[PDB]
Ligand binder design. Structure first.
Ligand SMILES: Nc1nc2c(ncn2[C@@H]2O[C@H](COP(=O)(O)OP(=O)(O)OP(=O)(O)O)[C@@H](O)[C@H]2O)c(=O)[nH]1
Ligand SMILES: Nc1ncnc2c1ncn2[C@@H]1O[C@H](CSCC[C@H](N)C(=O)O)[C@@H](O)[C@H]1O
Ligand SMILES: [Zn+2]
Lengths: 284, 705
RNA sequence: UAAAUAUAGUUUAACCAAAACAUCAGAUUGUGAAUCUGACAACAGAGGCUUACGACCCCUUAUUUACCG
């Protein structure tokens, strides 16, 4: 590719540019069809190396630090096998959740509204969100609805989980949540809903739209809910928090941690602990 | 507090180390009769405005053209068509907190500023420094402005100021990549100051070879220049053509002019002597013309909203109506037309607004309940019972403005036109840009309307209700001349103090009092003192010309010397208009059994405490006064910014109450139809209504807190 | 309408420049696994400029405050 015609002086020009690039990275560079977009991507691609080597340099510096102390310097009940035992324990709990647990739906029908940066970030929040469900005392039955098998979102999920994808204790499906559940019990959670969520209802299916629009697109989740006949609710952030800073649309890992706290009889004081403290000045 | 002055040192001493990167010239007023002629210059560090005409502030805010960053306002003539509406502009500048604004033009703005202080509050907080043409050259971080006074062959009414602007030289780009092969350390904080020398072009000794820096720097822009010149009429063509200063910029090849804006009518341009003048500038110089030949829309939102309401009822909401090859090529001015001067000289036509009605209707039906409600109302009214009481088509009430104080995209400041008969009319209030609303509402018929305008009433010395009065007078004189009718002074009923502003303007700025026959509002009251006989035959003219059986007035509860009104016709119908004021008992005694009542309804229900703080009423109090009026119908106007697009509908809204909009016609034969227009109304304004109910809720949370 | 702001896991720090705590996959761990090997690291967004940068300038969305002679 001739796209090297930009990089090979942009390094000499004085802008921050990474030294190691591949054709796969080079391909995504040419979709950036403006000077600022290319500069923004190159800045991201440059800082990837910057924290890599800095953390790289840290780790073998530690290797010398421990190898000198490790080489120079009884009755037990259990073998030290806890990480294996914890994973098995969460597996049994997840298997029980898939049968009797309350369903929670992550709507994957937002692939067409996301750029590559946003789509990748959605998976990262999805990975953390499902991780917190596993470690909970009373896990949800997590559903991935509207997830196209060949779609971009599915391929990214497979790449991140690798072998674990086929072994996850969650129900991923092509069908919409309206096909799996009665339309009366579905409550599409969205920040733009005019109805404020008062109490957590254990006989309802809460739908979270897996949409991370860093280029914020208000009303997208509400439009989907009103395109169907689904009811909507919004978190009582204004009721219990003194907001000052930032968007009121929380991340997927914060949302699931708020719902999990509510499901475990926690009040709104404990549940809203997971709203970033940088966005408000205390609970009232 | 504005970012413009707080981030001052970041801008740099000589700009950002030499010149601004981008500079274009945008037209906010293409020269139409209603909108006037105005020009806007954008730069990285400064923003300029030319010929701040009446209603220009409305156009600059509606087109997202920031006002809190303006530095100088250049006026080419000491004339109301060019200076009018500046009083509103300085109030807007004061609101934003801008400390200092510089005015330029004829030396008479010294007297103009002291003249407008009669009505406007002493502008505390904002510095107004008038810089006349006799002052030295004004140099800024971006550009240099040259002021040339031009005197016609015939205060001083023959003075015209023309501006020859000149952009400062911008330091060129630095060929940083080639400097490596020479040996320059591109690395940051490594012999960087050479770049400043590279910008300057001075030689620097590097790698044992002191080279002239322009070798490693792009050829710097010498700085394109543009000229702002206005030729009001024929008597200014000759002095402009023979102006010595202009020869220094057109005949020379070292100082080209990129663009020349021409604020002159069509008749001036076709003149042969003026024709030779543009070609003398050179074939390179583009020419822009702003005059009445422009055919474009400015108040797009007003046109947009008017078309949508026109679907509900065409008669009640009439549609707004818009009002020879040349040797030298020239480009007609259009709204938001741009001409970039740096780094490329080109005609940027992208931002020009388009006025396509079809979209505006299309937007209407896709609304949730608009199409159903309009259709439901149409069959109920057109194909239902008798269409109201059988009464005459006159009088008809024209609501040219329903704005509380500042103009807004949807509503202009208060101005109401009453058509007593087809051959006579009167103005109940004349706010800023009232003629613009008059011209937009009638189009080619504005001159006929001005010919039938017999009297003007002014409620209180508040500027929202009277600052547009001068603009009517010059247009009325032109309209009367076009119709051939003899020129006679207009009848104005207003408080005595209104003469103070007019006397100041007439003796210092421009002759306008010869069109004025002012009748003080004090002698119009009931049981009033017998005044001088000179006023006495004027009061007979008021009743005779306007066919009024009686014309009453009283002091309404507001700022001192504030007055209400009451029209009584020989036929019998009685129209009572109340300016800004809380429920007043004197008003109640005035218009008992009035046919129609127009009342101030500025605030919501639940804001009574600042309603008295601002001497202003709410909807329920205004409605309750209407019941105390025992009036057939009630009209609400003078809505505040909070009711930006639509008044909130209180449960007290009965069949005897109604809401007013801009360019909305109300006749006595439409009274029962007005309540029937409500169901369509929230249907179109549904997204807007939900904004009001929540912001009403937000204040409750503050009260609860 | 204007000014302040806007960290997509969370905080801190900020012209310091990357941390600390977390997250995902693999691990049969002899009790420092308190680890190892990998995955992901975008300070609202889209554009301009500039040798550059998080700076500077428009624009979009949003948040908190104020908002008429
Ligand atoms: N002073 C003041 N003006 C406000 C306030 N809220 C809204 N406005 C005014 O209302 C305008 C609304 O702007 P827009 O939202 O573009 O207006 P719109 O008529 O809804 O037009 P669209 O956005 O195209 O739908 C603002 O630009 C202000 O002029 C407020 O709190 N204070
Ligand atoms: N304050 C809040 N209350 C309820 N749900 C919220 C919320 N903030 C975020 N969410 C949920 O978290 C998900 C990602 S936030 C993104 C929402 C979407 N981009 C929009 O503009 O509407 C959404 O599906 C939303 O349902
Ligand atoms: Zn008023």
């Amino acid at each position: 590719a001739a796209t090297r015609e930009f990089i090979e002086m942009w390094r000499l020009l004085g802008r921050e540019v990474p030294e190691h690039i591949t054709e796969e990275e080079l391909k995504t560079l040419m979709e950036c069809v403006s000077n600022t977009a290319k500069k923004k991507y190159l800045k991201y691609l440059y800082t990837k190396e910057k924290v890599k080597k800095a953390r790289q340099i840290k780790k073998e510096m530690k290797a010398a630090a421990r190898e000198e102390a490790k080489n120079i310097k009884k009755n037990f009940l259990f073998l030290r096998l806890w990480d294996r035992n914890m994973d098995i324990a969460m597996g049994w709990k997840g298997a029980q959740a898939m049968q009797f647990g309350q369903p929670l739906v992550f709507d994957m029908a937002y692939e067409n509204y996301m750029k590559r940066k946003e789509l990748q970030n959605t998976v990262s929040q999805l990975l953390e969100s499902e991780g917190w469900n596993r470690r909970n005392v009373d896990p949800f039955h997590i559903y991935f609805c509207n997830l196209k098998i060949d779609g971009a979102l599915h391929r990214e999920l497979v790449k991140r989980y690798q072998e674990k994808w086929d072994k996850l204790l969650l129900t991923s499906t092509e069908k919409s949540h309206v096909d799996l559940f009665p339309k009366d019990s579905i409550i599409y959670l969205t920040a733009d809903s005019p109805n404020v969520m008062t109490t957590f209802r254990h006989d309802k299916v809460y739908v979270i739209g897996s949409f991370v629009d860093k280029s914020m697109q208000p009303g997208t989740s509400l439009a989907k809910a009103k395109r169907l006949n689904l009811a909507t609710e919004c978190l009582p952030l204004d009721k219990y928090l003194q907001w000052e800073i930032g968007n009121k649309n929380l991340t997927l890992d914060q949302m699931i941690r708020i719902l999990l706290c509510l499901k475990n009889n926690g009040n709104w004081q404990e549940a809203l602990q997971f709203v970033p403290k940088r966005k408000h000045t205390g609970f009232l | 507090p504005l970012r413009h002055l707080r981030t001052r040192e970041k801008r740099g001493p000589s700009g950002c180390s030499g010149g601004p990167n981008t500079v274009y010239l945008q037209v906010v007023a293409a020269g139409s009769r209603d909108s006037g002629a105005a020009l806007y210059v954008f730069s990285e560090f400064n923003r300029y405005l030319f010929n701040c005409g009446e209603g220009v502030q409305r156009l600059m805010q509606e087109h997202k053209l920031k006002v809190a960053r303006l530095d100088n306002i250049f006026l080419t003539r000491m004339h109301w068509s060019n200076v009018g509406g500046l009083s509103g502009m300085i109030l807007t500048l004061k609101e934003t907190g801008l400390p200092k604004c510089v005015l330029s033009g004829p030396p008479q703005l010294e007297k103009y500023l002291e003249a407008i202080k009669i009505f406007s509050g002493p502008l505390k907080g904002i510095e107004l420094a008038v810089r006349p043409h006799s002052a030295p050259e004004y140099e800024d971080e971006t550009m240099t402005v040259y002021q040339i006074p031009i005197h016609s062959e015939q205060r001083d009414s023959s003075l015209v100021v023309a501006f020859i602007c000149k952009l400062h030289l911008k330091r060129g780009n630095f060929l940083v990549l080639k400097a490596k092969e020479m040996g320059l350390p591109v690395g940051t904080a490594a012999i960087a100051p050479i770049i400043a020398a590279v910008k300057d072009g001075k030689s620097i000794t590097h790698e044992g070879r002191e080279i002239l820096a322009e070798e490693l720097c792009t050829p710097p822009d010498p700085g394109a220049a543009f000229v702002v010149v206005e030729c009001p009429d024929e008597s200014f063509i000759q002095p402009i053509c023979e102006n010595a200063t202009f020869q220094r910029y057109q005949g020379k090849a070292d100082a080209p002019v990129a663009l020349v804006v021409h604020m002159a009518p069509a008749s001036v341009l076709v003149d042969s002597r003026y024709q030779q003048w543009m070609e003398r500038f050179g074939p390179d110089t583009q020419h822009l013309v702003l005059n009445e030949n422009c055919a474009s829309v400015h108040n797009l939102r007003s046109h947009k909203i008017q078309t949508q309401l026109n679907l509900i009822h065409p008669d009640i909401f009439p549609l707004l109506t818009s009002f020879p090859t040349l040797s030298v090529p020239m480009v007609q001015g259009e709204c938001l037309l741009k001409y970039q001067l740096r780094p490329r000289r080109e005609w940027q036509r992208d931002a020009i607004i388009t006025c396509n009605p079809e979209e505006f209707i299309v937007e209407a039906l896709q609304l949730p309940n608009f199409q159903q409600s309009v259709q439901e109302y149409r069959r109920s009214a057109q194909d239902g019972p008798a269409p109201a009481e059988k009464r005459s088509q006159y009088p008809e009430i024209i609501f040219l403005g329903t704005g509380s104080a500042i103009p807004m995209k949807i509503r202009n400041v208060s101005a109401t036109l009453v058509n007593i008969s087809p051959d006579t009319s009167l103005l109940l209030d004349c706010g800023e840009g009232t003629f613009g609303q008059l011209c937009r509402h009638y189009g080619d018929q504005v001159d006929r309307v001005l010919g039938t305008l017999a009297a003007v009433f002014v409620s209180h010395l508040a500027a929202d209700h009277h600052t547009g009065l001068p603009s009517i007078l010059l247009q009325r004189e032109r309209a009367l001349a076009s119709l051939g009718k003899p020129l006679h002074p207009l009848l104005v009923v207003a408080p005595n103090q209104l003469k103070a502003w007019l006397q100041q303007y007439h003796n210092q700025c421009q002759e306008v009092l010869h069109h004025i026959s002012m009748i003080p509002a004090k002698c119009l009251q009931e049981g009033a003192e017998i005044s001088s006989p000179a006023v006495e035959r004027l009061i007979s003219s008021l009743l005779r010309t306007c066919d009024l059986e009686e014309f009453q007035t009283c002091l309404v509860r507001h700022c001192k010397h504030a007055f209400g009104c009451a029209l009584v016709h020989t036929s019998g119908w009685k129209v009572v208009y109340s300016g800004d004021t809380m429920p007043c008992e004197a008003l109640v005694r005035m218009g008992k059994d009035a046919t129609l009542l127009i009342h101030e309804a500025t605030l919501e229900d639940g804001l009574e405490e600042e309603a008295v703080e601002k001497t202003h009423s709410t909807t329920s109090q205004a409605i309750s006064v209407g019941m105390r009026m025992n009036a057939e119908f009630i009209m609400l106007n003078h809505f505040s910014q909070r009711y930006a697009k639509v008044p909130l509908f209180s449960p007290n809204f009965s069949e005897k109450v109604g809401v007013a909009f801009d360019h909305m016609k109300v006749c006595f034969g439409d009274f029962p139809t007005m309540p029937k227009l409500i169901p369509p109304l929230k249907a179109l304004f549904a997204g807007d209504i939900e904004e009001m109910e929540e912001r009403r809720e937000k204040r409750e949370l503050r009260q609860v807190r």
